[PDB]
Amino acid sequence: VTTENASTSIATAGIGGPPQQMDQQETWRTNFYYNDVFTWSVADAPGNILYTVQHSPQNNPFTAVLSQMYAGWAGGMQFRFIVAGSGVFGGRLVAAVIPPGIEIGPGLEVRQFPHVVIDARSLEPVTITMPDLRPNMYHPTGNPGLVPTLVLSVYNNLINPFGGSTSAIQVTVETRPSEDFEFVMIRASPADLLTTPVLTGVGTDNRWNGEIVGLQPVPGGFSTCNRHWNLNGSTYGWSSPRFAAIDHDRGNASFPNVLELWYASAGSAADNPISQIAPDGFPDMSFVPFSGITIPTAGWVGFGGIWNSSNGAPYVTTMQAYELGFATGVPSNPQPTTTTSGAQIVAKSIYGVANGINQTTAGLFVMASGVISTPNSSATTYTPQPNRIVNAPGTPAAAPIGKNTPIMFASVVRRTGDINAEAGSTNGTQYGAGSQPLPVTIGLSLNNYSSALMPGQFFVWQLNFASGFMELGLSVDGYFYAGTGASATLIDLSDLVDIRPVGPRPSTSTLVYNL
Amino acid sequence: GTTTDGMDPGVVATTSVVTTENASTSIATAGIGGPPQQMDQQETWRTNFYYNDVFTWSVADAPGNILYTVQHSPQNNPFTAVLSQMYAGWAGGMQFRFIVAGSGVFGGRLVAAVIPPGIEIGPGLEVRQFPHVVIDARSLEPVTITMPDLRPNMYHPTGNPGLVPTLVLSVYNNLINPFGGSTSAIQVTVETRPSEDFEFVMIRAPSSKTSPADLLTTPVLTGVGTDNRWNGEIVGLQPVPGGFSTCNRHWNLNGSTYGWSSPRFAAIDHDRGNASFPNVLELWYASAGSAADNPISQIAPDGFPDMSFVPFSGITIPTAGWVGFGGIWNSSNGAPYVTTMQAYELGFATGVPSNPQPTTTTSGAQIVAKSIYGVANGINQTTAGLFVMASGVISTPNSSATTYTPQPNRIVNAPGTPAAAPIGKNTPIMFASVVRRTGDINAEAGSTNGTQYGAGSQPLPVTIGLSLNNYSSALMPGQFFVWQLNFASGFMELGLSVDGYFYAGTGASATLIDLSDLVDIRPVGPRPSTSTLVYNL
Amino acid sequence: GTTTDGMDPGVVATTSVVTTENASTSIATAGIGGPPQQMDQQETWRTNFYYNDVFTWSVADAPGNILYTVQHSPQNNPFTAVLSQMYAGWAGGMQFRFIVAGSGVFGGRLVAAVIPPGIEIGPGLEVRQFPHVVIDARSLEPVTITMPDLRPNMYHPTGNPGLVPTLVLSVYNNLINPFGGSTSAIQVTVETRPSEDFEFVMIRAPSSKTVDSISPADLLTTPVLTGVGTDNRWNGEIVGLQPVPGGFSTCNRHWNLNGSTYGWSSPRFAAIDHDRGNASFPNVLELWYASAGSAADNPISQIAPDGFPDMSFVPFSGITIPTAGWVGFGGIWNSSNGAPYVTTMQAYELGFATGVPSNPQPTTTTSGAQIVAKSIYGVANGINQTTAGLFVMASGVISTPNSSATTYTPQPNRIVNAPGTPAAAPIGKNTPIMFASVVRRTGDINAEAGSTNGTQYGAGSQPLPVTIGLSLNNYSSALMPGQFFVWQLNFASGFMELGLSVDGYFYAGTGASATLIDLSDLVDIRPVGPRPSTSTLVYNL
């Protein structure tokens, strides 16, 4: 593994003392080791760039380990490419080393640099050596300076004479340091957000606080801002990453076995530091009108009541299971709404209270872990539906990207019609939906991930089942995506074994769904 | 003599265990793993001494007291620890350099010896009857001691080295300060350097796995984690000088529990029970040991609180009772009796078909729920179901706040549950959070009516971690795993036992400790349980 | 051993970074600039050691605490800095001599090491895991340590040298006094001389300027603070330093180290003049006002006319006199022809206020605000005009209702700043300070200093010469983010350190105190150079 400029590199690296870790018989620098992997699809046009890497010791695991205790490095590195194709594919790739000071972009003519050619049917690996073309005498670890770059681009487009569901292949990259690599001057990503316990039975969703049991695709698309954080440490909702009792002090309560009706105007929660739209914990679902004996369907119900705002004492005769929601113009006519601007928050008991109370000013106290109201023992579709979600203005939306569809996390929740059916019951199963897992939301609200991902990429994890595996992507806005296409069937997580991170991937690349 | 460079060992003190035969045999036998790696003798990381540790020598240390002791390991040098991540075996010796920061007026001496493998290290080990070296407190130049690699195997795998020698430094004669006063301690700095025969073999992947350090991380106690009884954000630490016990939602370091609940808060639901009301107070009850639908245990339904029942009748409101919102539902079809929805109080009581009496033993007891307010209309049924929420509140007759609950006498535990008792100056503590009270459902923190605190035994993430993973070999019986909590002014130590109880060095005090000034948590590791934890607050 | 001469290095201590390969490579690569200059080995300026700095060592310093840092530069020697004015490049190492003024009864050790370039210097640096040397507190002869030139460039340009190594000295073991008592500290002196391979290249004309400035050493010279320089807000002679433990912000007439400003004024005091505004008086108090963001004639910014004070407006009416308000003498002039309304000449108060067509309310944000001037005394005759001009003087006074003096103004809550202005906050034991001068007050226009009625102090953020220098020259490469450029102020009893950041705020090591520091005993100012911003500045007063 020789280079054309080894002598000058070694001579000029002497400014930092004698070379270190330069024993040529060492095991860590005689073999190739895995570095990375990328995707090559039939949609890639000729001249498009598929892989780019800057020269650094971070391209080999053992050089990365050894760089923890050294302040400088010099020398080149050898790269190896392994293509996992078959005999029916056709196409070529080209790889070249770009000297420093040359712009890298779509208008780069890799085919006119000194290069090598990689075939889609190639069995033996193709190697290329990147020398250390540097304007400095050595590369300090903190501020390496100008370095050359390795660029991979399509030479001839990939073709599949069969045609079907196989439109992409994978290419593996392995590295090995050159003979002239050396160290001098001895010195002293959101990968952990989604770990296996989060989805194997410990983590819970951020809307119903129930154990996640499935993944529900949403081909139409949806939006969510209550208890939902992006990758910039900001939120558009009014709740904190916890489930604590909903408590408001000033509101209008009246009942004109009677149904107590409490309501208030939005934008009046001065005691909530996160936002003033609603008290912390208030659900972001629309209000379903009901009266008399009729029981509303798919409504958020919490146990609680009214309390005296003068001294904090509770009206013991108003304890019941109320339904909470957002509605507009409800001093007399209940009408659902999905916009917090110029709206009202309404709570109304679904059962007759012991005795009604008329007060101009009164407080509301409800629990945050609610249930779903249903008129009978039969189960309904997963709720809340995309048309029932209430969001603040300026909340970004999640839309399908090619064959990638945003999904929700589905858990099992109780229903009033039958409070005994949990799973496998003859009366059906009821599923609530959330946008993010609670540990993921807490992690996004605590730490900063504003530089780990660029706009237009997904951070991908791999979920491994007994039969095959699947990929799960996370965007910068905080929505999760799966490669389920236009299907809407619930995905079961019973057979999940472990979760393996993958990393940043283009958002226009279809995620693998081998189930 | 006042200047020492990075390659000077100083005075070379020799012990009889250092022989040429040992080094030659070690080098010859280490070849089973292939050619040696990282063996160049001119590398900078091998020729220099580097800082390893520091300890304190006080005038109050009796002769024989051990001041420093380490097992032979690549972890004793900063640069061998880095290189050990990519190798699967090692062999050879290591040198230890000691610098004493004393003066010419001090007296006292230290003794150092190398303990051969297979010998227990403890207070009963007499170092001075082994071959040893004596070092004076007036030493100006460094003194270097070499630990040879005495091993019955060909090499030490990084996964489990096996039998290894041990280096021990102890007090030979007491430190003497002729002037007396406030100056009564000196420091000793330890630096290490590998021997000429040290080597690595069998390169491996850096991300290859061969302690419960990650259980207690800063977010758990800075405002994210919650307690395992009231599901509220932990805000304080309450010492319990008397001692207590707890088994509901509480795991040990062996992956076992003595309670009946799972590490979560989900609605309490039971199907078969007796309900009667002889604005009326509905009374539901059932016999313990009848929860056939609960796989964890049959004592009670999952989520049922482990607090005793406080009797009450008429207008009188019970004090310090667990109250949950819910009611009765028809066990025949699962439909709920809509006229019985109210805030009930739940508890364990014995012989309550007519006379309420509290109890703290699940053996031959009953589970009782009773509404504290008048329901819309009572229901009489021989068989009925109970449905309550798991996140309860504390019942109080007025707006005033009471002491932290549940008190140690109110906790109900299954037979065979181990207890937590003070050990010297180490006292078990509980995690205190803020909970609502019925008398005033608006006071949260800083209110003029007082603050109400609920107590739990373990944080919820810690309980989940103990219930998922196995830690049955990380800690020996009689040691505490210690973390360090760093505040703005000073720091404190927190210990965890094998039974799962937390301990602090608060002595006999009982004042609540505030966690508002907490900055970060740093793990320390295993320590003897009879060593007083530092409480510099 | 008890006597040391200027050419004696004492005990020579070396580390692993001093190698033959480094010296040979440095000498070979330095040849791109031609033959070396100033290599006469018998010159006095090369053979003797000269003073660099003195620092203290206390018994309360824990191991790992950093006591002394220095960045490799020709400015570290008095004679190499002078010679650097006529050359375009340099290369080579430097020798550092340490003398410890200890005694035979003390204990404890120090540790020194050379830090390669590209490594941050701060509390997280473990000096003892580098190649290092240990020095006892009982050392009698001096100890010399050599810093080699570890550089990624062939040579260091005079303007922008590039990356250089650093020398750090920290505590190895605690200093101990066996007797105890009140004696708990000793002192260490550092001296420097160039190594045998130090050289200059490419002689240049002394009057030529380097694209990037060497360092802002000449910005803060002794005349600036001994009675000649003035502050940038009240144009008064600086007489004190006022610590601000709470923290503050300032953008009007305030420049950073990048040649940019966030205010609207120029580094001068010239008459405030605006042409279009609304004047009305509904002995009467004339009230003129205008909307912010309408100063189209001001090239620096459109927020306000050049010279307009950045203080909030204090409401007042009738006989009540506002307290701590900016008052300037002037009036209204006819915007049609430029003639002045001679009947409106009076001492007005100027400020920033929001929504004042009827209700005066103070504000501290220039976004969506208004500029308001209102006379504090009755004018000869009022004038009603829809459009009129305002002409005021820039050197104002402080309005007070009586002869008593008040606290220093403007307070941090009164300062008005544009959006995007960075703030100054305490860093460990380093607190931002303001420069305090003596200003007149309306209640008593005769009390200057030592009066029985009290002394009134105005405050500014930067001295005027410093602001002018920052606005003229470029210092965007002399300091890295996270370091302070430190000067030393020498008084009759002890000395103190003063740091300057990249944002342009000054810092002192006064901790949490807020007492004014007197500059009467100042003798001279000596530059020190770049230092970590997390290192406590010496305050031996």
Token digits of residue A123: 């069995």
Report how many Cβ contacts below 8 Å link chain A to chain B. Answer: 130
Resolution in angstroms comes to 2.5
Which of helix, strand or coil describes residue A65?
helix
Backbone CA torsion sign across B10, B11, B17, B21 = positive
Judged by CB atoms closer than 8 Å, whether chains meet at C118 and A143 is answered as yes
The answer to whether C10 and C142 have CB atoms below 8 angstroms apart is: yes
Per the rule left: phi > 0, alpha: psi between -120 and 50, beta: everything else, B424 is left
Buried b (16+ CB within 10 A) or exposed e, C377-414: eebeebbebeebbbbbbbebbbbbeebebbebbbebeb
Q: Give B442→chain A minimum CA distance, Å.
A: 5
Question: What single letter denotes the amino acid at residue A392?
Answer: A
Half-sphere exposure of C346 (CA within 13 A, CB side): 23
* Cβ contact B189–C174 (<8 Å): no
Question: How many CB atoms neighbour CB C6 within 10 A?
Answer: 12
Nearest CA in chain C to B180: C179
What distances in angstroms separate CA A183 from CA A3, A78, A378, B63, one per listed residue? 17, 17, 70, 48
Whole-angstrom CA distances from B167 to B22, B73, B77, C410 are 17, 11, 14, 66
Dihedral (CA of C365, C369, C371, C376) sign:
negative
Q: Which of B1, B140, B179 sits opposite C179 (nearest CB)?
A: B179
Which has the closest alpha carbon to A305: A349, A249, A257?
Answer: A349
**How far is the C-alpha of C273 from the C-alpha of C316, rounded, in Å?**
24
> Of the candidates C109, C139, C143, which has its C-beta nearest B99's C-beta?
C109
Helix, strand or coil, per DSSP, at residue B400: coil
Reference A169, options A110, A106, A121; nearest CA is A121
Q: How far is C196 from C435, CA to CA, in rounded Å? A: 45
Residue C143's closest chain B neighbor by CA? B3
d(CA B388, CA B386): 7
CA distance C29 to chain A (A): 9
Closest by Cα among B373, B352, B369 to B270:
B369
Q: Chains near A, with 3+ CB pairs < 8 A?
A: B, C
Tokens of C329: 């003498």
Question: What is the residue-wise DSSP string for A359-374?
Answer: BSS-EEEE-SS-EEE-
Residues of B in contact with A257 (CB under 8 A): 376
Beta carbons of C88 and C158 less than 8 angstroms apart: yes
**Cβ pair A311:B40 closer than 8 A:** no
Q: Which residue has the tokens 């003073």?
A: C51
Q: Tell me which residue in C24, C131, C163 faces A140 most closely, judged by beta carbons.
A: C163
User: Is A137's CB within 8 Å of C154's CB?
Assistant: yes
d(CA C290, CA C274): 9
3-state DSSP call for residue A81? strand
With CA atoms as reference, report the closest residue to B252 among B447, B82, B462: B462
Whole-number Å distance between alpha carbons of B282 and B265: 25
**Beta C143-147 vs C11-13: how paired, if at all?**
parallel
3-state secondary structure of B36: coil
* Contact residues, chain A, for B266 at CB < 8 Å: 210
The span from the CA of A210 to the CA of A213, in Å, is 9
Backbone φ and ψ of C9, nearest 5° = -80, -15
Query: How does DSSP assign C388-423, residue by residue?
Result: -EEEE-SS-EEE-SSS---S-BS-TTTB-B-TT---
Chain C residues with CB under 8 Å of a chain A CB are 16-17, 19, 21-22, 24-26, 29, 116-120, 125-127, 129-131, 150-154, 163
The DSSP bridge partners found for residue B303 are none
Nearest to A173, CA basis, from A84, A43, A264:
A84
CB neighbours of residue B42 within 10 Å: 8
Residue B382, CA distances (Å) to B283, B336, B347, C292, C403 in order: 12, 16, 20, 80, 90
C119 with A187: Cβ contact below 8 A: yes
Residues of A in contact with C32 (CB under 8 A): none
Which residues of chain A does B281 touch, with a Cβ-Cβ cutoff of 8 Å?
none
Contacts of B107 (CB under 8 A, 6+ apart): B137, B138, B173, B175, B176, B178
CB B29 within 8 Å of CB B201:
no
The answer to whether the CB of C370 falls within 8 A of the CB of C303 is no
Judge contact between C384 and C280, C-beta under 8 A.
Answer: yes
CB C397 within 8 A of CB C321: no
**Planar angle of CA C28, C30, C32, nearest 5 degrees:** 100
Q: Give the whole-angstrom CA distance, residue C500 versus residue C485.
A: 5
B205 vs B83, B210, C397, CA distance in Å? 12, 11, 74
Q: Provide the 3-class DSSP secondary structure of residue A287.
A: coil
The phi and psi torsions of B418 (rounded to 5 degrees) equal -70, 155
Nearest-Cα distance to chain A for B373, in Å, is 7
- C398: its two tokens: 């402080």
Query: Rounded to whole angstroms, how far apart are CA atoms C134 and C157?
Result: 34
| Residues constituting chain B | 537
Instruction: Look at B279 and A351 and tell me if their CB atoms are within 8 Å.
Output: no
DSSP string, A205-254: BTTT--BEEEEEE-SS-B---TT-B-TTS-BSSS--SS---EEE---EEE
- Residue A108 CA to residue A498 CA, distance in Å, equals 41
Q: Do C22 and A16 touch (CB under 8 A)?
A: yes
For residue C55, the cross-strand partners are C188
Partners of residue C11 in chain B, C-beta under 8 Å: 3
| Two tokens, residue B78 | 């900063």
Please tell me the distance from the alpha carbon of residue C197 to that of residue C28, in angstroms, as a whole number. 11
- Segments of A251-404 assigned E as strands: 252-254, 261-265, 299-307, 320-327, 344-349, 363-366, 371-373
Contact C152 A142 (CB under 8 A): no
Determine the Cα–Cα distance for residues B237 and B25; give it in Å rounded to an integer: 56
| C507: region left, alpha or beta (phi > 0 left; psi from -120 to 50 alpha) | beta
Nearest CA in chain B to C142: B3
Establish whether the linkage from the previous residue to B157 is cis, with ω within 30° of 0.
no
**Taking CB atoms and an 8 Å cutoff, what residues of chain C touch A72?**
116, 118
Give the residue from chain A lying closest to B335, CA to CA: A418
Taking CB atoms and an 8 Å limit, are C21 and A14 in contact across chains? yes
Q: Are B193 and B128 in contact, with CB atoms under 8 Å apart? A: no
Residue type, A79: F
If you ran DSSP here, which 8-state letter would residue A474 be given? E
What lies within 8 Å, CB to CB, of C329 at 6+ separation is C345, C346, C347, C348, C392, C393
Nearest to C119 among A11, A71, A138 (CB): A71
Rounded to an integer, what distance in angstroms lies between the CA atom of residue A72 and that of residue B204? Answer: 24
Count how many Cα atoms sit within 13 Å of the Cα of residue B494 in the half-sphere of its side chain: 25
CA distance linking residue A140 with residue C152, whole number of Å: 8
Q: How many CA atoms lie within 13 A of A102 on its CB side?
A: 16
For residue A141, the chain C residue with the least C-alpha distance is C118
- Cα angle A275, A280, A283 (rounded to 5 degrees) comes to 110
Q: How many CA atoms are closer than 13 Å to the CA of C143, on its beta-carbon side?
A: 23
**CA-based end-to-end distance of chain A:** 44
Amino acid at A355: N
Q: What angle do CA C191, C197, C199 make, to 5 degrees?
A: 90
Q: Which residue does chain A place closest to B222, by CA atoms?
A: A446
Q: Using CB atoms, which residue from C19, C125, C126 is nearest to A17?
A: C19
Query: 3-class DSSP state for residue C86?
Result: helix
CA angle B119/B124/B126 to nearest 5° reads: 75
Contacts 24+ apart (CB under 8 A), C279-284: C279/C332, C279/C383, C279/C384, C279/C385, C279/C388, C279/C390, C280/C384, C280/C385, C281/C379, C281/C382, C281/C383, C281/C384, C283/C377, C283/C378, C283/C379, C284/C378, C284/C379, C284/C381, C284/C382
Residue A16, classed as helix, strand or coil, is: helix
Neighbours of chain B (3+ CB pairs under 8 A): A, C
Amino acid at A461: W
The type of residue at B260 is: W
Q: Which residues of A touch C (CB under 8 A)?
A: 11-12, 14-18, 71-72, 136-143, 145, 185-188
- Interchain proximity B442–A320, CB inside 8 Å: no
Q: Where are the alpha helices (DSSP H) in C48-90?
A: 78-83
| CB-CB neighbours of C202 under 10 Å | 15
Give the number of B-C residue pairs with CB atoms closer than 8 Å: 84
Q: Left, alpha or beta for C247 (phi > 0: left; psi -120 to 50: alpha)?
A: left
Who among B3, B50, B179 is closest to C178 (CB)? Answer: B179
Q: Which tokens in the block code for residue A297? A: 């369907």
Q: Nearest Cβ partner of C116 from A12, A71, A145? A: A71
